[PDB]
């Protein structure tokens, strides 16, 4: 498995603004060190909603077709744009969990970096989020170049087939 980048090397959306990032995001594409297009091929699209709490944390809710609801708390870390997973002790399979907003323009897209340790294995990925379920090839290509930048290759990149069931909230 390809080694995880540091949080200093992974970019950080500057003056990240919790207010504008909140809300519904659709996972247009995902790319990461455990991903295999040749075996996996593609995956049904799912949404992630970032509900800004008065803490300034997020109550992150992912809606998935299968509807299945994956609900977590993202707690702000050392630099705005970074988070850890709230109450990690409740997740047997998780010994480390880092979230970092690499790039976003809040209106259209975001590229967000997820790193973690499960069963003594170091995983990482970046999702291509989009406020709509479709995105520009420039941004799809841009996203590709970004994951290539992190050491990943074409077999590590995957795009979601979109749906209407569950994910529109």
């Amino acid at each position: 498995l390809i080694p995880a980048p540091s949080l200093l090397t992974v970019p950080l959306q500057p003056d990240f603004r919790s207010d504008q990032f909140r809300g519904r995001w659709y996972v247009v594409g995902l790319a990461g060190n455990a991903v295999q297009k040749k075996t996996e091929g593609s995956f049904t699209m799912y949404s992630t909603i970032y509900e800004l709490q008065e803490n300034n944390s997020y109550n992150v809710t992912s809606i998935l077709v299968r509807c299945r609801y994956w609900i977590r708390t993202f707690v702000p870390s050392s630099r705005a744009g970074q988070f850890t997973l709230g109450n990690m002790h409740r997740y047997p399979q998780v010994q480390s969990y880092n979230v970092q907003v690499a790039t976003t323009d809040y209106n259209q897209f975001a590229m967000v970096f997820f790193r973690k340790t499960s069963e003594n294995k170091q995983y990482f990925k970046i999702t291509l989020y989009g406020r709509t379920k479709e995105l520009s090839p420039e941004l799809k290509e841009r996203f590709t170049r970004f994951a290539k930048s992190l050491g990943l290759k074409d077999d590590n990149i995957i795009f979601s087939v979109p749906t209407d069931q569950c994910i529109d909230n």
Partner: antibody
Framework: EVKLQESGPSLVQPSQTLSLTCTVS????????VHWVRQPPGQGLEWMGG???????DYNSALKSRLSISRDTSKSQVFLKMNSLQTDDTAIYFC?????????????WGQGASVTVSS | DILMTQSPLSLSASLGDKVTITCQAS??????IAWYQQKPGKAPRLLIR???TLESGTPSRFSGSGSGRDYSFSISNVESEDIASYYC?????????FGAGTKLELKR
């Protein structure tokens, strides 16, 4: 060869403001971070803050209120200004750099500037 | 912050002893740890980066290992010039955070 030199007055009154200059050589500020670490007498090392190649900066949260790190890319100079000094800011102030290629590890240090905060 | 607990605080060593400093990180830092040597009067110089990678200049008797939150630095055969303070550094995220350090003294 890569070189960093801290300079500026090495005796500061508690009232006053510290100003150190770091003059780098062997590399460009466009392409590298420069970070200040300090070390009080007989104590450990403390990262104070830094200026990345981009021009953006970050600081130790304990010193954000007082510390200001700037630069002049053309003159190959990075500047520190810290205010509201106290006796316990007496230390050796090291100038330092970290590069993206090495994953921002600290790999070069200046000689260090003794700074005594005394009246 | 990520806290770095370095130990032991002080070490007494005879020439040719194997010696091992240890560092535990408050969080997992995915091998982004470095080890520095600092002789009194001089700056710290980097010996090992990324857990186990030696710098040009580091003698082979220096080495480091670990993963996750737990890491270590070992001198295989202590020489006279190894006398110094050693520090570990986390550089996975800001703030950069150093261990409290190990002052290595030589017995004779």
């Amino acid at each position: 060869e890569v070189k960093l030199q801290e300079s500026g007055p090495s005796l500061v009154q508690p009232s006053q403001t510290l100003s150190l200059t770091c003059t780098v050589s062997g590399f460009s500020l466009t392409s590298n971070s420069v970070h200040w670490v300090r070390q009080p007498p007989g104590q450990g090392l403390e990262w104070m803050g830094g200026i990345w190649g981009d021009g953006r900066t970050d600081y130790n949260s304990a010193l954000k209120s007082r510390l200001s790190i700037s630069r002049d890319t053309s003159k190959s100079q990075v500047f520190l200004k810290m205010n509201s000094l106290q006796t316990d800011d007496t230390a050796i102030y090291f100038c330092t750099r970290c590069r993206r290629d090495s994953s921002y590890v600290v790999d070069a240090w200046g000689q260090g500037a003794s700074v005594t905060v005394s009246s | 912050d990520i806290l770095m607990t370095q130990s032991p605080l002080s070490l007494s060593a005879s020439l040719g002893d194997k010696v091992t400093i240890t560092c535990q990180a408050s969080q997992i830092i995915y091998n982004y740890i470095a080890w520095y040597q600092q002789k009194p009067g001089k700056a710290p110089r980097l010996l090992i980066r990324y857990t186990s990678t030696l710098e040009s200049g580091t003698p082979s008797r220096f080495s480091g290992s670990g993963s996750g939150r737990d890491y270590s630095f070992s001198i295989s055969n202590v020489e006279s010039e190894d006398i110094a303070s050693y520090y570990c550094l986390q550089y996975d995220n800001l703030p950069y955070m150093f261990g409290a350090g190990t002052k290595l003294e030589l017995k004779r």
